Amino acid sequence: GTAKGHNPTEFPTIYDASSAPTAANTTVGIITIGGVSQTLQDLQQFTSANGLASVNTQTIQTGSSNGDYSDDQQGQGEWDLDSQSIVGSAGGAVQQLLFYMADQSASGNTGLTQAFNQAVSDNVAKVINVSLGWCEADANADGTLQAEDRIFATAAAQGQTFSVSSGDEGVYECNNRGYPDGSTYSVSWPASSPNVIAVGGTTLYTTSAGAYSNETVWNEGLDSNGKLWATGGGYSVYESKPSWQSVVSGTPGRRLLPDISFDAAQGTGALIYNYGQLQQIGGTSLASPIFVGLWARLQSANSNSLGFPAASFYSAISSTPSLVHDVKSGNNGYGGYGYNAGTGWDYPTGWGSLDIAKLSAYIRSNGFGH
Ligand SMILES: [Ca+2]
Ligand SMILES: [Cl-]
């Protein structure tokens, strides 16, 4: 196995989804901050270059009609990562891609809150990507956490799956977003919500023939500014443990995250068109859209009838280890600190990555979600 970048259209063979239906019958949302005008040009470049049918898109202003929905330039690369990775992982088709755009001039943190709220109120997208996060203690301090958890709770109850990147700062989410802080560990919001699927990050190795080879923890160390780049994982200090996580014994009475993980290392990342230029990009901002595309295709295969799947993942994977690639090697800290991967569920990677063929067979036999 070796480390290299990957076209998004490769993610179905990597994660054993290529024999499954595509997401042609499922609508997918993406939460953005601001507009997506360049992103939509980049998406056209992507589908056209890959010879795929064009994607039906819609953009939704989720705040004031007088709000600021201008493009955030750096943001376009994130919405590019999300949209191209979703469509590739989905098998090259989604029913529609909805961009739920946060108002950049909204008061306090309410821009993003209103974007989550519109996706849930509309209840048109079955699966929604959130490649955004921040220190959960900061979200809690001004009441954002409480307000947004109510929204995600409504989403889960009505059968929508929010997928949220676990973070890119390893265990050091609340230390100025990623500077090593020794033994002080923290987690990201909204990944820490029990009402979303939290998606962590791996280093993906493939064979020369493109077969899955192995995954380790995503941890690419410090950048030139001294910031750690690694998969978020740990437990919430606020959120109680949901019933289904009781199967992970020896953990606190808190929401443990991530649930599952996919490719995140930049060194093994996705090739993404950004302002017209192909770039190799990682993060748990990649891992979450991979999951969203795979999950959307499982929804299509099941007439969009799968409910919020967290409890089903925990019962199925704990009893059926063949459903996942169990990550065993690496850590999500620095300097000897952080959590270590190991057998079964771990704090850097949760259960690991899904084998979609085996998961699809399991669902055909047993159903999924609640
Ligand atoms: Ca593991
Ligand atoms: Cl429960």
From Swiss-Prot:
Coiled-coil intervals, chain numbering: none
GO biological process: proteolysis
Residues the record marks as active site: E78, D82, S285
One function term, GO molecular function aspect: tripeptidyl-peptidase activity
PTM field: Autocatalytically processed.
Domain Peptidase S53, first and last residues per copy: 2-366
Protein name: Sedolisin
Residues represented out of the complete protein: 218 to 587 of 587
